[PDB]
Ligand binder design. Structure first.
Ligand code: GTP
Ligand code: GTP
Ligand code: GDP
Ligand code: GDP
Ligand code: MG
Ligand code: MG
Lengths: 439, 123, 427, 7, 429, 432
């Protein structure tokens, strides 16, 4: 049976794991005790406590997750949270000293201490499952733990499981705003693993959600938890066709196949709709026609880029709820007859549609209203090229003065790798420019 | 301090200055005394007893307790022989006082009767 | 886990550290006896950073009290939280230094460093994983400016990787109380630049200026200057002791604060500073914290960053708040004061959030910044040090200890090499 | 009311 | 079963033994009258080791108090636990030795050894299975340094297999009170090496240094040093009397402590000593014991082992503790201070566990150690002995007894032989 | 019916007797007075009064360690003459317990084992618990075993003993006792169970989360292991294995009788609540080097014969799947001349749990008896410690003083050098 394991790394991965696993528990109706002898019966998915949760004879469905961090406090709150009895304490692994926003520390000195323990944990998780579909890994490019310790982990995971897919949900640094100053070195240096030891990337910057939450959900003073709930909605929508039945069920393999035209181009963009508050939601009527039009709005993109400046190459569709095929069909035919939407010459047919039954559940105390239908978009496009260009511009002005270098070389990493990784993004930017040329 | 594992019976002498009302607590060191020779427990200062009920909105991490925030100061009224008195969570039962203190209390403060109370066990 | 050992040298160090131990005693809810009577569980989960457990439910500070004169130890033991410190942690000599750097560094410093290293090593091995040592001292003293520079040199050899933060007190020109003040400062700063990962320059006259205008205290004693310093000292490790939405520690900024090893001097600041009268009229919030941070009036040292150039900026936020507004203020102050930030480092601002508010307050904030204006303090000392060195004045006190003259020249050389490298980063 | 004289 | 007879020689021995007999009287809960009053069962389960049963529920110590001067007998009879001792066990002469070794062993020693022998053989035949005898004395006296050496000379011939432990007082070079001190000491260490199973070198100067600094008592009376040695004395046989998780006795340690018959001089340590202000800030944990046993300040000998090499280490722990924590620390101390241990002996440490703590305390530990630093004390005697023996000063007191001059030469030769071979075994491959 | 006699010697023997018989009494349901409130007949003999009379012999040379049992809760479980003590101890000295103090008490302890065996009709064998470091556990056990081999030539004799630890040690003269004891466990032994405390210390902190363990915590685990090996005899099972079968299926050559045990799962009561036990899952844990109770790496050697012991809700289908999993990895090595190296035994009743213990109430169990050549390196570290000892001739005068000839010291050193030399002879591959 299909199954996925979560590899959440660092503070960002753990906090996302708190939101996502809370959604998964509520999606299937699991108590924070990890049990369900409860009287009320929600759903009928006997097969569905698989995949995410692991059924046991005693009735507790222990989740298939791995929480790892090099500082204990971020996991310690999970150890004393509401779902403490839900999680396997050994699935929670802590470190005594963190990378301290240093890619080097988490890659050569501090990471290697717990690598053997972490990879051993993954093995027995993979031993429990029969058919593993792929790995879902969450981290951030800003912190050293999410950038350094994750990078070696995928390097050792790739040589251990050559065939199993590895998906990348990561926090990209925002173009204008930042929570660190040595951040560009770590993001420059973590691009190498996610280029050669990755299958699909899901970069998202924190600023775009602040734009989305303020403009649509009307939350004027948002928080991280508001960001995490939106992220959890995306991943459930990705896994929705796996968990429940549907007319057009899609697993992880097909939308990987129908998104990667060349091995070096695996950086799509995520888009979710509809995203509106409780008050405004019921006053409009909501159909398939307008929610896919919101999916093409530049202001609704999760990454600060204009797709009109770029050109679509492969768009993966994910419908869910009380959707009907024609209004999916008629939506697509309306999409094609717009000059503002541009497509590459070598992909006349650029859509992949999946259809599911279960409407998206709403966690109490959220911002999304309870709605009947939803839609998830995974659009590979060349408009993400400008994001790397700004990061190179930020890096170039600070490598020239050799700022912050002594922390890295003093840790034990060579300075020649710094110039090497910059050349890679110089190369990778030209690769997207090659596709943007039309014959 | 018998209740804690570090039980002690060290006697103390408490000075109140009529310069400005200030209290200091010196210790009585013994022959062996088990302890490093130290001058005093506490230094000349002003003890509050209760402060103004607006203490909830006072940033004690930045500004110190001051004469705006206190409404009452430690005075000789808690400092009466025969009755215990607490400073900083210390029981501090008064055993006795000096004859000059007895005089001053009887003829200038007003209470005439402050008899001594023994505090020593029978071995 | 993650422990901290607090070094305490000199009367300046002793009074500041004793006040500091009070302002985290009230936070972790420990009495002057040594027992816990706090309410929240988070108040007692990470107490091992600063306190060491004893029998009978008593928690002792991980502090080493050093001062070459026994008189200061009398006041510290006789303080409010006096009977909280261990007597063996008190180490003290019999003769002072007379405000002379050379005596406290070589002559009377040699007999006491072995005892200081003994207890420091004991406190080092007691903890399992150690992050670094913290030292509070004055740069114009005889022991902290003297022996204290000898202490930091020895520990760096013993423990190289561990972080060194120094809350040193640097003199002021307008108000000074010692004539041989420049000689000790100029001979101490050479020790900080070679062996210190980051330094927090604090000046008493800036504290006096703040109390004269910002806090509105009519008769400023030494305590309020110390309490305000102890607030900043608590404001840097509050993210370490408590959980937060965007967690941080002493290395996360220290990594993010040192572009080059020769530049580790910083401007500490504290945002919620208001007079008692205007406390009701002021409405503390993320904006009102921000504009109070960035003016030079709130700054805790004696250099105007307006004349200087901001290299890197830290904002450690204590309490519960919304970051999009926190983000917006940092981006806004970056955009409008564009001529005041560097052009070769974009996104100069580092931010961190710890959810626990300080005691007796709702919101608080700590600012640590590296700007070009720190060179103005150093060149000020050179204007007085050389003017007192051109006539060999007050040299027989230093020369009588057995020291040569090139030590004075090499100290002035490296500082003039420091500021020249510091000035070229401005331009 | 009764806590003795204690030593 | 496993009994011990407590010999008691000299004013040093009488005052030390009196303090010791009081100490284990407290542990076994027996009043000065002689009846048991203790609260626990095991306080009277193995009390036959030290005490003898008397009709009417009375226990008499198995002690033999000897001294050439009758003045000290009245003091020990006038002490707190003075009446507990049997009056017949008191044996004493009429004239002292005057700090003269030759008088106490040759001239005045001959008339009274038989009276000592009659009571000693009486107590030995009383116990069915005696583990051995036990003697406290001083090397700077005329009785213990004299008569005592004659006593250990005879008792080996009669009872060879029984364990001989000697808690002798060694002189200090810094503090001394006898002009003819080194002659007696040089004539006593020769008797110790031939006829003694193990020796514990105790020094008053180190006990003062402990009480000046560690306990920081301003006025050390002679009880405080006698209390310190008594605690070490009880810490050796506490595992014998009370059950433990890892049992041991005198023979268990002695086999593990003597690599060669010439090497039986040990160097004791007692952990839990702290000042009253030091109680206030202290966590009662076994790493705090282990650090405090192994520092040079705590030891009550006049030798710093940092210039020596630790041959064998023994640590008997008194209390209910975890031996994984116990075993790790001895492995830890063996690894960090590798230079101070012999390389031809892996696992230099012997450990034992006794669950019952000392009275009035929760945790304690007793340390016995053999190292090269004990040779630093014997040569320092020769620096003064030869300086006095070259000019033949103070010799007519020794010569007037009728003895020859060769005896000093052979005693100096034997100790020179011992310190020379001891250095060889320190730097042996 | 099959029977077994307990010949516990030394301070190790008496505490391991307390832990094992406590589990044994709870296993059958024995009240501490000795009353049932007959599968128990293998270890218990009945009277008119229904007292079950454990068939054990407690012997030591110090009375204090057995008097604690005499005042213990089970004072009315054990027979007063079965408790045999000595006035003086061997004092960590092999010769003292072998030539001076041991011989005084040999006559009585041989009369006791005679009477206990006279109670038994069909005796499967004896279990002996002793030590290699202590004098009484090494010396007295040697001569008792020396006289036990002649007294009963055929009867199986199992050796459960502790080995001196590779890094830590409780004494200093243990290698002299340890080296001199290998002669007895070679020419007078059928099976060996050397186990050091560090590895039991190692496993406790990582699995049971006991950061500060004690000897009772280890002794419960060894009480579990001795329960597992015999549980096939005590209760019924699909594939019942006795003492003879796993003895035959572990010993290819007479001088090679030192198997390495392994037990699983060892988890806390909390751990069982969020983890799913399975037959294949517990089988894998028996192969990890981090779970071995001997500080040696089997991946540095090769497995030569492995004995399997399943207990609980075990199904033969998952037994075969786990073993089929086992044979398909390169990391696990096997000797060339043994393609088939397993001996499977299946038992019904799950292991019980004693209150106040550490192991969770588990539904399935597994016991491993893996004999390999990687144990030979343990003896090599003993010789290096011994050779640095014997060169300077330390502590020899104690041994000489008792009356033991110094020529035996070299002879014992040469024997296990040959015993080591037998082991890499097996490690040679028969490359045709
Ligand atoms: N969107 C989002 N981003 C987060 C969250 N938590 C942390 N981050 C990002 O993570 C970056 C810093 O890394 P952290 O996750 O805090 O720490 P880390 O991954 O453990 O790496 P180290 O700091 O070296 O220990 C910040 O810049 C944030 O943008 C979160 O809950 N939501
Ligand atoms: N695993 C374990 N080892 C023990 C136990 N009891 C004693 N030992 C070991 O036995 C060794 C010493 O031998 P003991 O059994 O204690 O004493 P002994 O065998 O009677 O030898 P003697 O003391 O000379 O009489 C010690 O080093 C311990 O490691 C126990 O209960 N469990
Ligand atoms: N702000 C502040 N400054 C202090 C305090 N105590 C002392 N100082 C300063 O320290 C200087 C004297 O330092 P000193 O005692 O000689 O240092 P030492 O020689 O190391 O003991 C004076 O110039 C004071 O300004 C204090 O509590 N607060
Ligand atoms: N530590 C300690 N030393 C003592 C005690 N009593 C006497 N001495 C020492 O014994 C020495 C005198 O011994 P002495 O009476 O001549 O011994 P005797 O001739 O054998 O009786 C002095 O140097 C004292 O230091 C005591 O109670 N404790
Ligand atoms: Mg982090
Ligand atoms: Mg024994």
């Amino acid at each position: 049976m299909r199954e996925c394991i979560s590899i959440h790394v660092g503070q960002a991965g753990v906090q996302i794991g708190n939101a996502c696993w809370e959604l998964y528990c509520l999606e299937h109706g699991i108590q924070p005790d990890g049990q369900m002898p409860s009287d009320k019966t929600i759903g009928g998915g006997d097969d569905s406590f698989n995949t995410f949760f692991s059924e046991t004879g005693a009735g507790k469905h222990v989740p298939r997750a791995v929480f790892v961090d090099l500082e204990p406090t971020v996991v310690d709150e999970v150890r004393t949270g509401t779902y403490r009895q839900l999680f396997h304490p050994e699935q929670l692994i802590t470190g005594k000293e963190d990378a301290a926003n240093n890619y080097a520390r988490g890659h050569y000195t501090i990471g290697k201490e717990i690598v053997d323990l972490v990879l051993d944990r993954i093995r027995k998780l993979a031993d429990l499952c029969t058919g593993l579909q792929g790995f879902l890994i969450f981290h951030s490019f800003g912190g050293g733990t999410g950038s350094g310790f994750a990078s070696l982990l995928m390097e050792r995971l790739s040589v251990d499981y050559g065939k199993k897919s590895k998906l990348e949900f990561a926090i990209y640094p925002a173009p204008q705003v930042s929570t660190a100053v040595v951040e560009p070195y770590n993001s420059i240096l973590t691009t190498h693993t996610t280029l050669e030891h990755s299958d699909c990337a899901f970069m998202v910057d924190n600023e775009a959600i602040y734009d989305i939450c303020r403009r649509n959900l009307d939350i004027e003073r948002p928080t991280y938890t508001n960001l995490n709930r939106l992220i959890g909605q995306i991943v459930s929508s990705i896994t929705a066709s796996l968990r429940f039945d549907g007319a057009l069920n899609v697993d992880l393999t097909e939308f990987q196949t129908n998104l990667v035209p060349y091995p070096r181009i695996h950086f799509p963009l995520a888009t979710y709709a509809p995203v509106i508050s409780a008050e405004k939601a019921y006053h409009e009527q909501l159909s398939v026609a307008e929610i896919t039009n919101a999916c093409f709005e530049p202001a609704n993109q999760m990454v600060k880029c204009d797709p009109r400046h770029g050109k679509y190459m492969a768009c993966c569709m994910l419908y869910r709820g009380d959707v009907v095929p024609k209004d999916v069909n008629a939506a697509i035919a309306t999409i094609k007859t717009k000059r503002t939407i541009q497509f590459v010459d070598w992909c006349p047919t650029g859509f992949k549609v999946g259809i599911n039954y279960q409407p998206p559940t709403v966690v109490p105390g959220g911002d999304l209203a309870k709605v009947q239908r939803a839609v998830c978009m995974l659009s590979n496009t060349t408009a993400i090229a400008e994001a790397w260009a700004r990061l190179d511009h930020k890096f170039d002005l600070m490598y020239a003065k050799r700022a912050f270098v002594h922390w890295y070389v003093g840790e034990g990493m060579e300075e020649g790798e710094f110039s090497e990784a910059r050349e890679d993004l110089a190369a990778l930017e030209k690769d997207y420019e090659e596709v943007g040329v039309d014959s | 301090d018998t209740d804690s594992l570090f039980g002690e019976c060290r006697h103390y002498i408490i000075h109140y200055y009529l310069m400005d009302d200030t209290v200091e607590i010196r210790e009585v060191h013994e022959r062996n005394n088990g302890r490093d020779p130290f001058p005093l427990l506490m230094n000349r200062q002003r003890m509050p007893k209760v402060l103004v009920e607006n203490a909830k909105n006072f940033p004690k991490c930045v500004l110190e307790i001051s004469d705006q925030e206190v409404l009452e100061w430690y005075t000789a009224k808690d400092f009466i022989v025969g009755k215990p008195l607490t400073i900083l969570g210390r029981t501090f039962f008064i055993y006795d006082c000096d004859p000059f203190t007895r005089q001053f209390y009887k003829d200038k403060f007003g209470m005439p009767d402050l008899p001594p109370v023994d505090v020593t066990k029978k071995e | 886990m993650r422990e901290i050992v607090h070094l305490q040298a000199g009367q300046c160090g002793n009074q500041i550290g004793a006040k500091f131990w009070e302002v985290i005693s009230d936070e972790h809810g420990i009495d002057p006896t040594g027992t816990y009577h706090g309410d929240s569980d988070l108040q007692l989960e990470r107490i091992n950073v600063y306190y060491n457990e004893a029998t009978g439910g008593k928690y002792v500070p991980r502090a080493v009290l050093v001062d070459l004169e026994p008189g200061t130890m009398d006041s510290v033991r006789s303080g409010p939280f006096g009977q909280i410190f261990r007597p063996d942690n008190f180490v003290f000599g019999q003769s002072g230094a007379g405000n002379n750097w050379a005596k406290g560094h070589y002559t009377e410093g040699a007999e006491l460093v072995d005892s200081v290293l003994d207890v420091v090593r004991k406190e080092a091995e007691s903890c399992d994983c150690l992050q670094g040592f913290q030292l509070t001292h004055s740069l114009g003293g005889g022991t902290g400016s003297g022996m204290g520079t000898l202490l930091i040199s020895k520990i760096r050899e013993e423990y190289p990787d561990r972080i060194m933060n120094t809350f040193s007190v640097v003199p002021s020109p307008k108000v000074s109380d010692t004539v041989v003040e420049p000689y000790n400062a100029t001979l101490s700063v050479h020790q900080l630049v070679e062996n210190t990962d980051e330094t927090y320059c604090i000046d008493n006259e800036a504290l006096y200026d703040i109390c004269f205008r910002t806090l509105k205290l009519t008769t400023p004693t030494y305590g309020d200057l110390n309490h305000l310093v102890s607030a900043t000292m608590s404001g840097v490790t509050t993210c370490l002791r408590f959980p937060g939405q965007l967690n941080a520690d002493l290395r996360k900024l220290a990594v993010n604060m040192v572009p080059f090893p020769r530049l580790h001097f910083f401007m500490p600041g504290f945002a919620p500073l208001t007079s008692r009268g205007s406390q009701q009229y002021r409405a503390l919030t993320v904006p009102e914290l921000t504009q109070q941070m960035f003016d030079a009036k709130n700054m805790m040292a004696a250099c105007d960053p307006r004349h200087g150039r901001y290299l890197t900026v830290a904002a450690v936020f204590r309490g519960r708040m919304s970051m999009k507004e926190v983000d917006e203020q940092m981006l806004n102050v970056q955009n409008k004061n564009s001529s005041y930030f560097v052009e070769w480092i974009p996104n100069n601002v580092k931010t961190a959030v710890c959810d626990i508010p300080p005691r007796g307050l709702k919101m608080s904030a700590t600012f640590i910044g590296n700007s070009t204006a720190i060179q103005e303090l150093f060149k000020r000392i050179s204007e007085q040090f050389t003017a007192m060195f051109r006539r060999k004045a007050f040299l027989h006190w230093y020369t009588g200890e057995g020291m040569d003259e090139m030590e004075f020249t090499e100290a002035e050389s490296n500082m003039n090499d420091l500021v020249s490298e510091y000035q070229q980063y401005q331009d | 009311q009764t806590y003795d004289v204690r030593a």
